[PDB]
Scaffold this active site. Sequence first.
Site, PDB file in Angstrom:
ATOM      1  CE1 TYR A 164      -6.479   0.307  -4.130  1.00 42.14           C
ATOM      2  CE2 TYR A 164      -5.302  -1.547  -3.144  1.00 42.14           C
ATOM      3  CZ  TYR A 164      -5.329  -0.472  -4.025  1.00 42.14           C
ATOM      4  OH  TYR A 164      -4.235  -0.180  -4.782  1.00 42.14           O
TER       5      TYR A 164
ATOM      6  CG  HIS B   9      -2.070  -1.039   1.051  1.00 44.84           C
ATOM      7  ND1 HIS B   9      -3.277  -0.774   0.443  1.00 44.84           N
ATOM      8  CD2 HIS B   9      -2.103  -2.331   1.427  1.00 44.84           C
ATOM      9  CE1 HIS B   9      -4.020  -1.859   0.452  1.00 44.84           C
ATOM     10  NE2 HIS B   9      -3.326  -2.823   1.055  1.00 44.84           N
TER      11      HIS B   9
ATOM     12  N   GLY C  81      -4.894 -12.773  -5.053  1.00 37.91           N
ATOM     13  CA  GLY C  81      -3.936 -11.779  -4.604  1.00 37.91           C
ATOM     14  C   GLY C  81      -2.563 -11.828  -5.281  1.00 37.91           C
TER      15      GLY C  81
ATOM     16  CG  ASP D  25      -0.633  -5.496  -8.685  1.00 39.87           C
ATOM     17  OD1 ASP D  25       0.334  -5.294  -7.866  1.00 39.87           O
ATOM     18  OD2 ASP D  25      -1.861  -5.695  -8.339  1.00 39.87           O
TER      19      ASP D  25
ATOM     20  CB  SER E 274      -1.348  -9.182  -9.968  1.00 42.07           C
ATOM     21  OG  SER E 274      -0.902  -8.581  -8.774  1.00 42.07           O
ATOM     22  CB  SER E 275      -5.554 -13.247 -11.787  1.00 39.23           C
ATOM     23  OG  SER E 275      -6.579 -12.571 -11.078  1.00 39.23           O
TER      24      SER E 275
ATOM     25  N   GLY F  68      -8.286 -13.828  -8.312  1.00 40.50           N
ATOM     26  CA  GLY F  68      -8.662 -13.093  -7.124  1.00 40.50           C
ATOM     27  C   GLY F  68      -7.896 -13.558  -5.888  1.00 40.50           C
TER      28      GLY F  68
END
Lengths: 391, 391
Positions: free
Chosen positions: B235, B43, B137, B185, B139-140, B135
């Site tokens: 987020y 973040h 985490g 990403d 970064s698909s 999904g």
Amino acid sequence: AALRQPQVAELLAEARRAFREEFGAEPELAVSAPGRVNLIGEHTDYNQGLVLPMALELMTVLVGSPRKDGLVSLLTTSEGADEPQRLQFPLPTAQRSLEPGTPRWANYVKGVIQYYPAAPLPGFSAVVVSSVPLGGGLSSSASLEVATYTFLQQLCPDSGTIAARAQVCQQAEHSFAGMPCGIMDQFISLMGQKGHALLIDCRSLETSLVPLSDPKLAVLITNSNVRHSLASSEYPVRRRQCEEVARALGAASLREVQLEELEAARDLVSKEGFRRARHVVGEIRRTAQAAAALRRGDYRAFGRLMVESHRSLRDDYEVSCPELDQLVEAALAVPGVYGSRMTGGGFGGCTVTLLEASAAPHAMRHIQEHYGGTATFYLSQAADGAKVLCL
Amino acid sequence: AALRQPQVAELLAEARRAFREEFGAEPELAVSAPGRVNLIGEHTDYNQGLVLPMALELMTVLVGSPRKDGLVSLLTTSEGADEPQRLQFPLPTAQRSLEPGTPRWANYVKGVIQYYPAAPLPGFSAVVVSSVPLGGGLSSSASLEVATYTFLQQLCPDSGTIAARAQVCQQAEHSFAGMPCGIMDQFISLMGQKGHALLIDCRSLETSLVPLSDPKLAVLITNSNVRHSLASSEYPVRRRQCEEVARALGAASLREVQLEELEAARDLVSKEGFRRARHVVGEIRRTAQAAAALRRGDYRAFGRLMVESHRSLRDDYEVSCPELDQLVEAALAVPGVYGSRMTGGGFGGCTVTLLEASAAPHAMRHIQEHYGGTATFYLSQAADGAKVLCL
Ligand SMILES: CC1=C(C(=O)Nc2cc(C(=O)O)ccn2)[C@@H](c2ccccc2Cl)N=C(Nc2nc3ccc(F)cc3o2)N1
Ligand SMILES: CC1=C(C(=O)Nc2cc(C(=O)O)ccn2)[C@H](c2ccccc2Cl)N=C(Nc2nc3ccc(F)cc3o2)N1
Ligand SMILES: CC1=C(C(=O)Nc2cc(C(=O)O)ccn2)[C@H](c2ccccc2Cl)N=C(Nc2nc3ccc(F)cc3o2)N1
Ligand SMILES: OC[C@H]1O[C@H](O)[C@H](O)[C@@H](O)[C@H]1O
Ligand SMILES: OC[C@H]1O[C@H](O)[C@H](O)[C@@H](O)[C@H]1O
Ligand code: NA
Ligand code: NA
């Protein structure tokens, strides 16, 4: 009047045509790999130093197809290449390694095959073309090696990093051309990104991209169109002399030495070894500072550091020549020029000049004016590195 | 036992087979783009901070061909993609733009088409396949955006730099998926290199490729197999509080606030906001320190920074969850583990763990045994970024 840099499509089309005529069918596979100009950081790479090159639009293109018979059959159209311009030889085997020979151009290709780390490699037919001026100091040979390497990967995928590929090509250069080069030229040929120079740490092999996305900034490459006798000759001498100063100070390399320690050990090394080492230690520092300057778009500081680089190369390292020096001075005269220096190995080849884009027409007029011989010019944008071209 | 990571050859064969069946012929073009894990620097990217991700061997592969009819026709084989898994729509024009809709997976493709900076883009048929857990985490979504972008470049070459491509994909994510992500990403999927992490300065967009070459070490990725209701949700709230804290301190971003300056300015900001910014400003410092530890080979120091990152995300930024925390604590009890933390956005997804490669069998058994859920695992090496695959 800058030289039209042929785009990848024109080079490809020349490669394919000559391939068809020579082999009787279309090539299956294709690759490109560029030459490079070094912005600053000369004779530091083999000293585990820092270098700051960019990839050029001048490039080598290679097209080809696998064979089933274990042979390699090569053709180059490059007009400077020493004859013959065709060559065949068997692939290296467990029974029999390849050796350096003539023509010299083919030694770069032989070397890369010999050290290629993945198996089994089939034979192949190929044509190589290049817009990189041949041994005019913009890394024609490295572009040829990396083109070869990148083609071999299409025949037989490798399994290591990009630094390993650069090292294979370097090894080819050492064993097959008798030229004990550092890693810069290969590494930039592989790693170049368009709109970016590359700060390469030749100790860690860490690389960082530094932007050049200012349309008000130009990089001008002036080819002296001279190649004095001493690449063959003097380059390995400077390397050995550097290694000897490192050995004498108990240092793994000159990267580990700074100017105060060098000066305190004057008595342990030759006068001439001192001067060589002084260049290198200073050049490493200049490159680190130039990279920082480039980042904050302080071109004036960058150009100053370029000029100090040139003086150090000319005087302490003694790898300039009257022509490079004259070109450098001619360019420094021109309003809008931030800096100028010889680039690459020296004894000939090109200078690199950083300037305001709008001064580029005057720069070229005036340099040509104030030079005895006949310069040629490239207006050069920072380019991508090696890639596959899907046919 | 770690899950098997299909190689590119296997994904390409699946994709070609699905494409043959769906569209009646072989595909003409192909590309791949990887998912990613973030080693440290969470973040921070949208705070113009520092991040240190690496590309994974999990990846998205797209095969397709140009069409003549101005239509886009799509099919995915990815088993958990939302319905329909095939669909068709016309290209956007000047008068009519695409819009976010259903299914959600296709929003990533639509967005990249919509913001693709070059013209003219033809219609096309494509199949997308992926080994990146959707999904989870890793970064698909970015891997799908980048594979799409890279595929569009084969239809219609673009002209900007690699960073501009990352930004197109970011913009697609903002507008088409309602997700106001940073650049990390997309950048890592585009610029990753085998055997390297990527230090991204998200303020200047400078990047460094930092070697990961110690074969005695590994990175273990543990998927908690949970995704709470907050990728959607908390987020954007966090991002908006960072923005208000910066504004209140008179800073363009939290990147320009030093930790000790923030600490003395508690009274200018809310209690919660302070804690969020403390996480961010501290994490930026931790990232710079972690990159230094990596360069010096200090994996013990790197690990301790990872744990401090997790504790900060858990307590100051509040984006962990009890599964992730349980996974982290189980990891840190295994001898040979140097550090462990959540990675990516939070509220589920994966932890990343730095450990002796010989401790990895023990760690996977210990972690699964001490986890209330069902973990899955990957042992992933640092991989290459996006590329073209010649058919
Ligand atoms: C050998 C190697 C790495 C690698 O990926 N090599 C590679 C991959 C390929 C390919 O993708 O084809 C091709 C060629 N080489 C990985 C690794 C290896 C095995 C499992 C997981 C991982 Cl992630 N990293 C490290 N370790 C390392 N992590 C550190 C963390 C902090 C630090 F301070 C120092 C660190 O040293 N060792
Ligand atoms: C340094 C060098 C060469 C050279 O002569 N090296 C050498 C010199 C000595 C010595 O001096 O004893 C001993 C051993 N090696 C030649 C060269 C240089 C100049 C004029 C003609 C030539 Cl042939 N070629 C290249 N590069 C090159 N050749 C290509 C051909 C096609 C192609 F697509 C790309 C090519 O890139 N660079
Ligand atoms: C974050 C995200 C998705 C998501 O649901 N985003 C979203 C959520 C909301 C909301 O919450 O309201 C609103 C707007 N967007 C989905 C997803 C996530 C989880 C399960 C199923 C799916 Cl489909 N897809 C992806 N990634 C992805 N889909 C692929 C398909 C093929 C492929 F080769 C690669 C693919 O990579 N990642
Ligand atoms: O900096 C000088 C330069 O000279 C030659 O080009 C070599 O190929 C490089 O490795 C480097 O040593
Ligand atoms: O570091 C947290 C991380 O969360 C998500 O994965 C976003 O896509 C990234 O831009 C980043 O903000
Ligand atoms: Na002249
Ligand atoms: Na369990």
